[PDB]
Write an enzyme that holds these catalytic residues in place. Sequence first.
Site, mmCIF file in Angstrom:
data_model
loop_
_atom_site.group_PDB
_atom_site.id
_atom_site.type_symbol
_atom_site.label_atom_id
_atom_site.label_comp_id
_atom_site.label_asym_id
_atom_site.label_seq_id
_atom_site.Cartn_x
_atom_site.Cartn_y
_atom_site.Cartn_z
ATOM 1 C CG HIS A 77 -2.243 -0.933 0.951
ATOM 2 N ND1 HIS A 77 -1.873 -2.330 1.625
ATOM 3 C CD2 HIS A 77 -3.207 -1.006 0.259
ATOM 4 C CE1 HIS A 77 -3.123 -2.980 1.284
ATOM 5 N NE2 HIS A 77 -3.820 -2.265 0.379
ATOM 6 C CG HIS A 81 -1.640 -0.293 -4.382
ATOM 7 N ND1 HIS A 81 -2.158 -1.378 -5.101
ATOM 8 C CD2 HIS A 81 -2.709 0.360 -3.456
ATOM 9 C CE1 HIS A 81 -3.732 -1.112 -4.928
ATOM 10 N NE2 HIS A 81 -3.725 -0.316 -3.963
ATOM 11 C CG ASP A 118 -4.804 2.085 -0.724
ATOM 12 O OD1 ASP A 118 -6.034 2.048 0.118
ATOM 13 O OD2 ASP A 118 -4.755 0.954 -1.332
HETATM 14 C C1 LIG Z 1 -1.921 -9.440 -5.114
HETATM 15 N N1 LIG Z 1 -2.740 -9.730 -4.186
HETATM 16 C C2 LIG Z 1 -3.564 -9.386 -3.334
HETATM 17 C C3 LIG Z 1 -3.925 -8.112 -3.131
HETATM 18 C C4 LIG Z 1 -5.136 -7.557 -2.311
HETATM 19 N N2 LIG Z 1 -5.481 -6.198 -2.211
HETATM 20 C C5 LIG Z 1 -6.327 -5.418 -1.365
HETATM 21 C C6 LIG Z 1 -5.899 -5.536 0.117
HETATM 22 F F1 LIG Z 1 -4.714 -6.141 0.506
HETATM 23 C C7 LIG Z 1 -6.432 -4.972 0.872
HETATM 24 F F2 LIG Z 1 -6.218 -5.281 2.270
HETATM 25 C C8 LIG Z 1 -7.789 -4.284 0.696
HETATM 26 C C9 LIG Z 1 -8.206 -4.160 -0.461
HETATM 27 F F3 LIG Z 1 -9.221 -3.353 -1.115
HETATM 28 C C10 LIG Z 1 -7.304 -4.830 -1.506
HETATM 29 F F4 LIG Z 1 -7.878 -4.740 -2.744
HETATM 30 N N3 LIG Z 1 -5.905 -8.176 -1.596
HETATM 31 N N4 LIG Z 1 -5.297 -9.608 -1.517
HETATM 32 C C11 LIG Z 1 -6.051 -10.720 -0.540
HETATM 33 C C12 LIG Z 1 -7.098 -10.600 0.155
HETATM 34 O O1 LIG Z 1 -7.755 -11.681 0.608
HETATM 35 N N5 LIG Z 1 -7.708 -9.333 0.417
HETATM 36 C C13 LIG Z 1 -8.903 -8.985 0.814
HETATM 37 C C14 LIG Z 1 -8.955 -8.802 2.247
HETATM 38 C C15 LIG Z 1 -8.242 -9.693 3.206
HETATM 39 O O2 LIG Z 1 -8.131 -7.477 2.285
HETATM 40 C C16 LIG Z 1 -10.400 -8.595 2.636
HETATM 41 O O3 LIG Z 1 -10.560 -7.783 4.006
HETATM 42 C C17 LIG Z 1 -5.215 -12.068 -0.963
HETATM 43 N N6 LIG Z 1 -4.232 -11.652 -2.060
HETATM 44 C C18 LIG Z 1 -4.207 -10.274 -2.354
HETATM 45 MG MG LIG Z 2 -7.447 0.902 0.626
HETATM 46 ZN ZN LIG Z 3 -5.658 0.129 -3.019
#
Ligand SMILES: CNc1cc(Nc2c(F)c(F)cc(F)c2F)nn2c(C(=O)NC[C@@](C)(O)CO)cnc12
Ligand SMILES: [Mg+2]
Ligand SMILES: [Zn+2]
EC number: 3.1.4.53
Length: 326
Positions: A77, A81, A118
């Site tokens: 973040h 990003h 962010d």
């Molecule tokens: C490149 N990979 C990723 C980016 C990614 N990006 C991402 C993130 F890390 C956030 F904290 C909030 C968001 F809005 C996101 F788009 N999330 N992610 C996960 C995941 O489970 N994220 C969802 C979660 C557990 O934040 C819901 O609270 C797994 N891999 C990724």
């Molecule tokens: Mg965010």
């Molecule tokens: Zn973001």
Amino acid sequence: VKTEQEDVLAKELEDVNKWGLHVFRIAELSGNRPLTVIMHTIFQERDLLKTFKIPVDTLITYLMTLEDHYHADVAYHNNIHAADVVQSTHVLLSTPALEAVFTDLEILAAIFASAIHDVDHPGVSNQFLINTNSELALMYNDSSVLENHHLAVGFKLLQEENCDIFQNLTKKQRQSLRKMVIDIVLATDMSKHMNLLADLKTMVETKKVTVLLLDNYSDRIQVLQNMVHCADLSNPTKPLQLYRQWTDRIMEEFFRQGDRERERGMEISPMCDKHNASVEKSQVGFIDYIVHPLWETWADLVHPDAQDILDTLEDNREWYQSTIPQ
Ligand SMILES: CNc1cc(Nc2c(F)c(F)cc(F)c2F)nn2c(C(=O)NC[C@@](C)(O)CO)cnc12
Ligand SMILES: [Mg+2]
Ligand SMILES: [Zn+2]
């Protein structure tokens, strides 16, 4: 005349209209200024400086200030990003199915919202901030803590010396832009994902074409919120060389949070335990339950514009599936 490093940067920036831009190479070439350079390129490309009478020195000062408020020590973040979400939104705004749909102000709102979405992220979740009784969670009543903060910082930074990029907008333009930016960044909170997707599905069911036809603010803002949400969740849809770098960064960020939770005696958040991790299973799960359902619905809305993005997503999902250790 441009420096040799500046010319290599200008050549990389020729792919600003393409999905799969070498954003990490741009971050290195610009001297850790991907957000400033990409935003400046996009504002020039879309003639936003001329349209909104934005002084160029004011735009550069604000962009540098905004970029400086993204944390260099946060693995995912950060300003790379932000630059990536901006450029992905820029490509999504140019999709044939959305040609001449949005006004210059709505375009400015989606790009500005993506840039600040962010800002000042500490590299920890809303829940970690709530559980520690942080001053941020106290200010925002434990509700979209980070998302409310990203917005307040993005707007507060306009008050720094020569940073007001909206100085020549009328009060009506500023209130409309402000409302759209807020609606968009607050929709980036993952707790809003299911309701946002459900409403995008509803719109796909009752879809009217003239190229998409969006009559009211409610329909127009829903598309813009889903678009920036798609740009925010676009890493698994990118070429595998890019996606893998995003995965390494988010895992490093998650593991650092788990280390902080562990040393504090707190319950370790899902995917944050480096000792009990399944990076591949976590990516298949993120794609299956969040990314694919969202992008499949977006691909239906803009059919057939997002077909190659959806194909790369499905290929990246099978690469991770084949990588799961038995
Ligand atoms: C490149 N990979 C990723 C980016 C990614 N990006 C991402 C993130 F890390 C956030 F904290 C909030 C968001 F809005 C996101 F788009 N999330 N992610 C996960 C995941 O489970 N994220 C969802 C979660 C557990 O934040 C819901 O609270 C797994 N891999 C990724
Ligand atoms: Mg965010
Ligand atoms: Zn973001």
